[PDB]
Design an enzyme around this catalytic site. Structure first.
Site, mmCIF file in Angstrom:
data_model
loop_
_atom_site.group_PDB
_atom_site.id
_atom_site.type_symbol
_atom_site.label_atom_id
_atom_site.label_comp_id
_atom_site.label_asym_id
_atom_site.label_seq_id
_atom_site.Cartn_x
_atom_site.Cartn_y
_atom_site.Cartn_z
ATOM 1 N N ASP A 35 0.826 -1.206 0.000
ATOM 2 C CA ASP A 35 0.000 0.000 0.000
ATOM 3 C C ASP A 35 0.860 1.256 0.000
ATOM 4 O OD1 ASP A 35 -1.880 1.988 0.297
ATOM 5 O OD2 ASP A 35 -2.539 1.365 2.299
ATOM 6 N N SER A 199 -0.322 15.711 -11.897
ATOM 7 C CA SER A 199 -0.539 15.349 -13.283
ATOM 8 C C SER A 199 -0.755 16.616 -14.101
ATOM 9 C CB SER A 199 -1.773 14.444 -13.395
ATOM 10 O OG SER A 199 -2.089 14.161 -14.741
HETATM 11 N N1 LIG Z 1 -6.388 1.768 1.237
HETATM 12 C C1 LIG Z 1 -6.012 0.694 2.167
HETATM 13 C C2 LIG Z 1 -7.019 -0.450 2.206
HETATM 14 C C3 LIG Z 1 -6.741 -1.662 1.599
HETATM 15 C C4 LIG Z 1 -7.673 -2.697 1.622
HETATM 16 C C5 LIG Z 1 -8.890 -2.496 2.247
HETATM 17 C C6 LIG Z 1 -9.939 -3.599 2.292
HETATM 18 F F1 LIG Z 1 -10.864 -3.405 1.306
HETATM 19 F F2 LIG Z 1 -9.303 -4.787 2.128
HETATM 20 F F3 LIG Z 1 -10.589 -3.594 3.491
HETATM 21 C C7 LIG Z 1 -9.169 -1.279 2.846
HETATM 22 C C8 LIG Z 1 -8.240 -0.257 2.827
#
Ligand SMILES: NCc1ccc(C(F)(F)F)cc1
Length: 330
Positions: A35, A199
């Site tokens: 992430d 951008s």
């Molecule tokens: N942006 C971070 C994130 C990643 C995955 C999820 C989920 F959908 F897996 F809960 C929520 C938030």
């Protein structure tokens, strides 16, 4: 040193991508959502509330001979989608595709929100934003990239996400066979802790390119492309029958449509997102209305170049002393 690992979509819509990560001694392999929009490496664990675990693989620190409890350290994170998790902290050995960090902070979940419990394919997150966002208290911890940086051949990592197919995260090197043309680099502001850039504009399908500055973040942890309402209206106006649905929570369109592409500017360069990348399928099982992959950022506060945008490109996250972002077509 370098590392290289394959990243795989969790489902048929590319809702997220998971990458295997080795934690502890002997190795415990968990599939984590890398992430670039957050800075905590957290995992489902033997400590996670039982009713909140539903098929995930857990990290069990008591079975790792290199795990050490980080005394008094806790963490708690809330994501822009409304999801959350929290727990305590160990240090342990973490490896991604042959690249190893000893003493990495591994945040063990005691609680996770419903959206995580319901995604049985995501065993946790590996944050790759700037360490200033890390939530560990009272002593903030470093990301895996931050810990590995000095040892890497080059202080970089790259994201090469696939459309409906596996892709690659590389650390420490740029695979010059993985993209076409050249990589265009663009300035980054780290002031909000994100890979935040500007951008230079957009086009819809074969339309005229509009030069306009769009500040936003490169976020592999967000599925969709969130852009200003003017831009998003201009895109969906080209799709017969598309409309913004308040009940659904964004733009929807007839599943029978063939979508136009969307182009974004990186300096003088252009990244073209094929229209099929923008189709996120029926709003509910069996519906003929489909959810759009480009949505308004108006309620968010920031534009987000999520997976819909990033998977159209080879993306360099350059952690040189002045960080920058590189984009190439592929
Ligand atoms: N942006 C971070 C994130 C990643 C995955 C999820 C989920 F959908 F897996 F809960 C929520 C938030």
């Amino acid at each position: 040193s370098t590392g290289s690992a394959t990243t795989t979509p969790i489902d048929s819509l590319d809702d997220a991508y998971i990458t295997p990560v080795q934690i502890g001694t002997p190795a415990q392999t968990l599939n984590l959502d890398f992430d670039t929009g957050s800075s905590d490496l957290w995992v489902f664990s033997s400590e996670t509330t039982a009713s909140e675990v539903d098929g995930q693989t857990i990290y069990t620190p008591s079975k790792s001979t290199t795990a050490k409890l980080l005394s008094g350290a806790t963490w708690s994170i809330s994501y822009g989608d409304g999801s959350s998790s929290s727990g305590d902290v160990y240090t342990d050995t973490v490896s991604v595709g042959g690249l190893t960090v000893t003493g990495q902070a591994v945040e063990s979940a005691k609680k996770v929100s419903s959206s995580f419990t319901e995604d049985s394919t995501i065993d946790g997150l590996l944050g790759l934003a700037f360490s200033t966002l890390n939530t560990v208290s009272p002593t903030q911890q470093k990301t895996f990239f931050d810990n590995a940086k000095a040892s890497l051949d080059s202080p970089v990592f790259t994201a090469d996400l696939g459309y409906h197919a596996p892709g690659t995260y590389n650390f420490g090197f740029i695979d010059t066979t993985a993209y076409t043309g050249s990589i265009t680099y663009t300035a980054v502001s780290t002031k909000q802790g994100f890979w935040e850039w500007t951008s230079t504009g957009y086009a819809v399908g074969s339309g005229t390119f509009k030069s306009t500055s769009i500040d936003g973040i490169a976020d592999t942890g967000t599925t969709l492309l969130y852009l200003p309402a003017t831009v998003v209206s201009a895109y969906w106006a080209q799709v017969s029958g598309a409309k913004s649905s308040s009940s659904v929570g964004g733009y929807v369109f007839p599943c029978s449509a063939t979508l136009p592409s969307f182009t974004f500017g990186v300096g003088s360069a252009r990244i073209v997102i094929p229209g099929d990348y923008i189709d996120f399928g029926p709003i509910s099982t069996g519906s003929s209305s489909c959810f759009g992959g480009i949505q308004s950022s108006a309620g968010i506060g920031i534009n987000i170049f999520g997976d819909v945008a990033l998977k159209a490109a080879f993306v360099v996250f350059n952690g040189a002393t002045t960080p920058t972002l590189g984009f190439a077509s592929k």
